[PDB]
Amino acid sequence: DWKDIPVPADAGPNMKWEFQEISDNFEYEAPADNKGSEFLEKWDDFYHNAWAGPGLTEWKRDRSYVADGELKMWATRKPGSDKINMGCITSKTRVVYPVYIEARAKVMNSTLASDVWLLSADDTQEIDILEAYGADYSESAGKDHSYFSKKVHISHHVFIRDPFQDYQPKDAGSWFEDGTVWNKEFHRFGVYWRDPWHLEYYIDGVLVRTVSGKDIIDPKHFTNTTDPGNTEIDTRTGLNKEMDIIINTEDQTWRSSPASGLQSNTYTPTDNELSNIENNTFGVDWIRIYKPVEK
Amino acid sequence: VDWKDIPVPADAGPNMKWEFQEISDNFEYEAPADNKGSEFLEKWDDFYHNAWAGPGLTEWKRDRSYVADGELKMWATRKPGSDKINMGCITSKTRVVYPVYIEARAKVMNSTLASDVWLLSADDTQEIDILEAYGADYSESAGKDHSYFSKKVHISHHVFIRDPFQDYQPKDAGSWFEDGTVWNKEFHRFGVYWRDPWHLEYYIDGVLVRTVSGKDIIDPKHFTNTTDPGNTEIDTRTGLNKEMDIIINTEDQTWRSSPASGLQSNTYTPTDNELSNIENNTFGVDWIRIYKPVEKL
Ligand SMILES: [Mg+2]
Ligand code: NA
Ligand code: NA
Ligand code: NA
Ligand code: NA
């Protein structure tokens, strides 16, 4: 049972993990165009503002649904356009450290991103639990896509919005690779957001990455309460803000319009690829959230 | 025993060790009150962290601090033609931030004035009080025995909203440490491990006397929210995250020289007779040492 599975992070001395009721194993029916009350008590079937998404993405309420024990989400071409309509849902309740959040999900066999992530209300702080481009092959680029099919991006962002700036860790360990082709099975992707300066990523119950300390979380001081981006002044906040849980798929600009201009580095679904619906359906069996509490 | 050889009582953690910071000072130079000189001035400004001249009857003065005989020293005198009291205040020229252990060896004044070693953010919203103590045996202004306070060390922290003004600190009984010691008789060590924005440990003479940990005690009212301060339904609290100036001073505080009650029996501030004893109104700090935890190589 999903609640029998141990949480792999360490709750602390004389602490245990307490299941949060905002968790969801999607064992109800929620038709795409009429979600119903069970879905809507925990989830909104859009992004947390009216932005319809990055690159060719045009998020739609009716591109998410739940059936057969899973949250499901699929992609179709927007008629008369290059855009792709796609699913996006957001939690109605926010989460904050310390918290362990884990999704059992099956990365799409698609060049589109399959995402489970966290985002603060003011869009300045982000934790990416799963961001993965799972296709075996890409017709757009005309190449084997196993460079990406075997990788899971595990990361976090801090932003300045006024003029837009974006930081994330870029070291090699931010892309986890086993030999596992992620699209073949459901896997568990989790994060222990322990405090503003410490993140631990777990895949299938195993610690795969620790992101700890100021130098890697916010070296450019984008989280300064006073004068963001100024490293002479330290009023850094770290990842402190409560966050919405977001599950979506995305066409991202660096993929559909790559900086190089080359078709060979352009990874986005052709119409032929979109005609296979299962390949472009992201499935989440469950998402569970625990908080550490005193024994 | 050497100030740098004394073990730091806070635990650096697994695979960590304590690294002495050069902004520490054992005050083994001369710095005349009215002309401090270059050794003092590389580490310290001989005033508060802005131009504000202090609370209550306080009127801070550059020339009421000095260093001599191995000590930072600071004294109080009545302002000519006034009830106000001229007194010392210095602040560090470099700021500190968690994780950090900061400890002063200091002798609390035998005076109703506050003897203070504390930390304060540049924007005045966040404050950590390592030592705040009112050390007099007796108060001639109140006409009573002052041992209620002479045996207490206030160890605390504040978070503020500037507009409109709101002040939160922990008010439980443990925020005033008392073991029978009369703090004004000897130099003692007063330290804080500011470990992270939600965790403080207070050490006196190398012993853990108090731990202030968690959101419910550090900022239960959400004064450190980044958006909508004071709104407890929204959680963007930062805790004690902001880098801070080190401040060492004495103070006449308003709650003492003009108490809420309006009563002379609750009024604790020096008379002219008491100020005439210079030693009683001289705060001495032998040293202040600052360590940061670093990974062992
Ligand atoms: Mg004694
Ligand atoms: Na397991
Ligand atoms: Na399920
Ligand atoms: Na002295
Ligand atoms: Na000294």
Q: Answer whether B294's CB lies under 8 Å from B16's CB.
A: yes
Q: At which residue do the structure tokens 């100036």 appear? A: B245
Distance A150 CA to ligand 3 centre (A): 24
Q: How far apart are CA A203 and CA A190, in angstroms?
A: 6
CB atoms within 10 A of CB B259: 16
Q: Which residues contact B185 (CB under 8 A, 6 or more apart)?
A: none
- β-strands B58-60, B85-87 pairing: parallel
Among residues B296, B294, B292, B295, which one has the least CA distance to residue B24?
B292
Q: Cis peptide leading into B229, omega within 30 of 0?
A: no
Question: Are B252 and B39 spatial neighbours (Cβ–Cβ below 8 Å)?
Answer: no
Q: Contacts of residue B235 in chain A, CB cutoff 8 Å?
A: 94, 96, 241-242
Q: How far apart are CA A17 and CA A29, in angstroms?
A: 29
C-alpha–C-alpha distance, residues B72 and B258, integer Å: 29
Q: Which long-range contacts (CB under 8 A, 24 or more apart) does A275-281 make?
A: A277/A74, A278/A109, A279/A108, A279/A109, A279/A110, A279/A135, A280/A74, A280/A75, A280/A76, A280/A108, A280/A109, A280/A110, A280/A112, A280/A249, A281/A72, A281/A73, A281/A74, A281/A75, A281/A108
B123, B198, B236 ranked by CB distance to A226: nearest: B123
B39 is catalytic: no
CA nearest B235 in A: which residue? A242
Pairwise CA distance, residues A120 & A101, whole Å: 15
Largest CA distance in chain A: 60
A125: closest chain B residue by CA: B236
Q: Strand B16-20 relative to strand B282-295: parallel, antiparallel, unpaired?
A: antiparallel
> Could you tell me if A20 lies within 8 Å of chain B, comparing CB atoms?
no
Q: Phi/psi of residue A128, each to 5°?
A: -100, 105
Residue in the block written with tokens 């899971």: A152
A238/B234 touch (CB, cutoff 8 Å), yes or no: no
Q: B224: distance to nearest CA of chain A, Å?
A: 10
CB B101 within 8 A of CB B287: no
Method: X-ray
The architecture (CATH level 2) of B1-297 comes to: Sandwich (2.60)
CB burial of residue A179 (10 Å; 0-12, 13-18, 19+) = exposed
Widest CA span of chain B, in angstroms? 61
Q: Is B150 helix (H, G, I), strand (E, B) or coil?
A: helix
SS3 label, residue B185? helix
d(CA B129, CA B118) in angstroms, rounded, equals 4
* A111 touches A135 (CB < 8 A): yes
3-state DSSP assignment of residue A61: helix
- The C-alpha R_g of chain B, in whole angstroms, comes to 19
- With an 8 Å Cβ cutoff, are A237 and B241 in contact? yes
List, in order, residues 6 or more apart from A195 with CB less than 8 Å away: A97, A98, A238, B196, B198
CA of B151 to the centre of ligand 1 (A): 9
Query: Alpha-carbon distance A249 to A277, whole Å?
Result: 14
Structure tokens at A7: 């949480």
Residues of chain B neighbouring A15 (CB-CB closer than 8 A): none
| Resolution of the experimental model, in Å, one decimal | 2.3
Nearest CA distance, B80 vs chain A (angstrom):
40
Distance CA B199, CA B193 (A): 8
- Collapse the DSSP code of A47 into the 3-class scheme (helix H, G, I; strand E, B; otherwise coil) and give the result: coil
Asked if B242 has any chain A CB less than 8 Å from its own CB, the reply is: yes
Task: Give the integer Cα–Cα distance in Å for A44 and A23.
Answer: 14
Question: Which residues does chain A have within 8 Å of residue B236's beta carbon, measured at their own beta carbons?
Answer: 120, 240-242
Backbone CA torsion sign across B48, B52, B58, B64: positive
Substitution target in B95, B238, B245 with the highest count of A β-carbons within 10 Å is: B238
Cβ count within 10 A of residue A285: 17
Q: Report whether CATH 3.30.413.10 matches the domain A1-295.
A: no
What's the angle, vertex CA B12, arms to CA B8 and CA B18, rounded to 5?
55
Q: How far, rounded to the nearest angstrom, does the alpha carbon of residue B270 sit from its chain's CA centroid?
A: 20
Task: Return the HEC string of A81-119.
Answer: CCCEEECEEEECCCECCCEEEEEEEECCCCCCEEEEEEE
Instruction: Please give the backbone phi and psi of residue B259, each rounded to the nearest 5 degrees, phi first.
Output: -65, 155
CA distance B15 to chain A (A): 14
Report chain breaks in chain B, C–N > 2.5 Å, as residues after which they occur: none
Asked, as a colleague might, if the bond just before A98 is cis with ω within 30 of 0, I would say: yes
Helix, strand, coil % over all residues of chain B, rounded to 5: 10, 40, 45
A–B interface: beta-carbon pairs under 8 A: 46
Interchain contact, A235 vs B242, CB within 8 Å? yes
Tell whether omega for the bond before B170 is within 30 degrees of 0, i.e. cis.
no
Under DSSP, is residue B53 helix (H, G, I), strand (E, B) or coil? coil
Region label for A111, one of left (φ > 0), alpha (ψ between -120 and 50) or beta (otherwise): alpha
Q: Is the separation of the CB atoms in A65 and A58 below 8 Å?
A: no
Asked if A247 and A48 touch (Cβ cutoff 8 Å), the reply is no
Residue B249 CB coordination number (10 Å): 24
Active-site pick, A126, A185, A232, A242: A126
Return phi, psi of residue A290, to 5°.
-125, 150
Copy the structure tokens of residue A149: 């099919």
Give the closest-approach CA distance of A263 to chain B in angstroms.
43
Contact between B109 and B278 (Cβ < 8 Å):
no
* Residues forming a β-bridge with B295: B16
Instruction: Respond yes or no: is residue B42 known to be catalytic.
Output: no
User: Any idea what DSSP says for residue A41?
Assistant: H
Cβ of A233 under 8 Å from any chain B Cβ? yes
Rounded to whole angstroms, the Cα distance separating B207 from A268 reads 63
Name residues with Cβ closer than 5 Å to ligand 5, which is an ion.
B 26-27, 70, 286-287
- Burial string for B189-215 (b: 16+ CB within 10 Å, else e) reads bbbbbbbbbbbbbbbbeeeebbebeee
Given a contact cutoff of 8 angstroms between Cβ atoms, the answer to whether A130 and A282 are in contact is no
> Annotation-wise, does B253 bind a ligand?
no
Of the candidates B19, B71, B103, B127, the residue annotated as catalytic is B127
- Which two three-digit tokens encode residue A32? 């795409």
Binding region of A = 47-49, 123, 157, 161, 166, 168, 250
Judged by CB atoms closer than 8 Å, whether chains meet at A235 and B241 is answered as yes
Q: Confirm or reject contact between B195 and chain A (CB < 8 A).
A: no
Alpha-carbon distance of A227 to B11, in angstroms, equals: 33
Are the Cβ atoms of B235 and A94 closer than 8 angstroms? yes
> Beta A15-19 vs A281-294: how paired, if at all?
antiparallel
In A, minimum Cα distance to B121 occurs at A235
What type of residue is B136?
A
Question: Which residue in the list A131, A177, A232, A294 is annotated as catalytic?
Answer: A131
B18 SS3 class: strand
Q: What is the radius of gyration, based on Cα positions, of chain A? A: 19
Phi, psi (degrees; rounded to nearest 5) at A52: -95, 0
d(CA B240, CA B224): 8
> Are A20 and A291 in contact, with CB atoms under 8 Å apart?
yes
Q: Are B99 and B200 in contact (CB under 8 A)?
A: no
Q: After which residues is chain A broken (C to N over 2.5 A)?
A: none
- Cα(A190)–Cα(A94) distance, integer angstroms: 17
Paired sense of beta strands B244-251 and A70-74, if any: unpaired
Distances (CA, A) of A211 to A62, A198, A239, B117: 36, 6, 12, 35
Helix (H) or strand (E) holding A37: helix A37-42
Asked if the C-beta of A96 comes within 8 angstroms of chain B's C-beta atoms, the answer is yes
DSSP three-state, residue A132? strand
Assign 3-class secondary structure to A177-224.
CCCCCHHHCCEEEEEEEEECCEEEEEECCEEEEEEECHHHHCCCCCCE
DSSP-derived secondary structure for A214-269 = HHHH-TT-TTBSSSTT-TTS--B--S-S-EEEEEEEE--HHHHS-TT--GGG----
**Token digits for B248?**
């060492």
Going by the annotation, the residues of the binding site of A for substrate are: 47-49, 123, 157, 161, 166, 168, 250
DSSP at B283: E
Residue (of A141, A129, A57, A144) closest to A91 by Cα position: A129
Six-digit token pair at B120? Answer: 């304060």
